[PDB]
Ligand binder design. Sequence first.
Ligand SMILES: *c1cc(=O)[nH]c(=O)n1[C@@H]1O[C@H](COP(=O)(O)O)[C@@H](O)[C@H]1O
Ligand SMILES: *c1cc(=O)[nH]c(=O)n1[C@@H]1O[C@H](COP(=O)(O)O)[C@@H](O)[C@H]1O
Lengths: 323, 322
Amino acid sequence: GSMGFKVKLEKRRNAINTCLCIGLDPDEKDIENFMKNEKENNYNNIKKNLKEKYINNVSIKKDILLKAPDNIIREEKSEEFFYFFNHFCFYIINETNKYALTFKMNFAFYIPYGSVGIDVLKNVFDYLYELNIPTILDMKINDIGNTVKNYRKFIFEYLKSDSCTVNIYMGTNMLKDICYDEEKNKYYSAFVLVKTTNPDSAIFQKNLSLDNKQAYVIMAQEALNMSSYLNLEQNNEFIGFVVGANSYDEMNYIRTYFPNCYILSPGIGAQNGDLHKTLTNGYHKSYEKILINIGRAITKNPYPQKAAQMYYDQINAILKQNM
Amino acid sequence: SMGFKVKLEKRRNAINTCLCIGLDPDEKDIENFMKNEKENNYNNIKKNLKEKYINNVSIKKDILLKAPDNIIREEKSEEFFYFFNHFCFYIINETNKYALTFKMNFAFYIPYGSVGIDVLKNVFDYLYELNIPTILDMKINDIGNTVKNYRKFIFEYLKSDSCTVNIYMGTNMLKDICYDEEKNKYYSAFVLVKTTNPDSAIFQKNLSLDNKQAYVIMAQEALNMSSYLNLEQNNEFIGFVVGANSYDEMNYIRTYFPNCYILSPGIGAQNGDLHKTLTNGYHKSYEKILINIGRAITKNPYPQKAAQMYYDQINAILKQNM
Ligand SMILES: *c1cc(=O)[nH]c(=O)n1[C@@H]1O[C@H](COP(=O)(O)O)[C@@H](O)[C@H]1O
Ligand SMILES: *c1cc(=O)[nH]c(=O)n1[C@@H]1O[C@H](COP(=O)(O)O)[C@@H](O)[C@H]1O
């Protein structure tokens, strides 16, 4: 893993020929359903997880993770939730990774049980790192410089994430303490929020303006200005933009006015975005520049390998059309 | 269980301040506590051990209750957990008598992985036992389905009284942060309005709508959402984060939203001016202007005295405004 995110994404894209970003946002029902299904089926999927060589290379509680499932429930009741949570994530990754340009894990899904889910998240990032699959930590972080450097450490040193999401409403100077580490002279990549998928996203992103430009345009320009100041792209890193898969006019504007920007686009599947429109409006011939994120539509499907294949094939068909 | 509004008003009646003590321990603070404690025969850990509510923390209590020499020899893997939690307990023990509320910034508790989240849980349990109003400062923002997870973590797991939120994505997220329809539960939040970072003008002031700077638009929309959720009827509220270094905005906000709740960081380490901030943001229900002080207390070698001086100063200024 000795290459910048820009180069890592380019190589993978060249290898697997897609821009599918698979979202791994397991909720409590997903974990419970997994536990239930595995008990009913002789734990087939966990046994398959246990086969995989890199499972021996994760950091946290291997002594538990590598135990036989029927042992967990019988002798390790307190470690049960950790075990089934972690094995669910490993299962999704094992089934879908061959279709994924990148995986994006949203931090919110890993925190609500306290420390246990952060052990899971750490093992998920360790695992993806070993598989050499590009990663995004979706955490829409924001704070003053002194405070955000703690997120930089968590995300880029502890998890060894390739990138993260950031909300720059507080200002762009925070990026100096996220995309750059002055002590180590390391650079990192991020996606800043530009236009989001929530139904009332226009209220600030579009209604606020300076002169005749809407906030989302100003914010995108300011992010880019900070990327140039930081020399990110000279260091094979970048600041890109989050633009929702339902925001078809904004996607078109962003791609038109910032031709070579990297775009991360959530909102397909569960949130009902239009894939043809989104992919067409954000298209770049280096299509790692238009990451299409699909979470629940893959992870909540009874056969996530087949779900990921469907989206992979659907995307590639639209990619072929754009040519 | 009466609501944050009531908790704040009642604590203010008991202690007569609006000091909010920030508990943001960094690695150097934990390491420096560990060093000091060794050099003074664990004077402060010994004191921590003699307090009643240590016996009520949820996570690894046995470990916390052990003597420091028994940890260092027999539980070395728990050493960092032990010293991190005991630094937090020490600050709380030395300063809580002066605090209207404690604010913990999440960022300080995550960068070592899970260990600091167990610490954070124990901290919130300890504060809850002492009846001290709490704020989790995490500046959350996401789509509704996602932020429900932060509602659970913050308000069900930590049992925080409130949190901070960034509503730049939109205000609708607040329905899944300050309200739980299924359980009929209501919670309080402070939204970012004007922040302390040097370049905060870039979007907060330079963007506008109608004839008003963005920070005013955002404050108004947050209040619109608060009334839609009927928080104040359930003794909760949506309040504003306004920097202690942002006098014009504080003045504008206090003038145009007369009865709003304001959280004001930026005094001490970030150089705000306590007198101007407190005058410009003043309200006679002064739990409505919480002055946050983090590093100027936690990085002071005599933190009880540092809290005391802020308390005394706030009180003399609160006297001036009558
Ligand atoms: C972040 C920003 C945004 O505008 N929209 C979003 O949905 N998100 C995050 O992206 C993921 C969507 O997943 P799904 O709808 O495919 O399940 C999720 O992590 C959300 O927080
Ligand atoms: C949040 C928003 C803001 O505008 N300014 C801030 O400083 N913060 C947070 O408040 C705390 C300040 O602590 P200190 O400067 O007294 O140490 C800290 O948690 C920061 O993230």
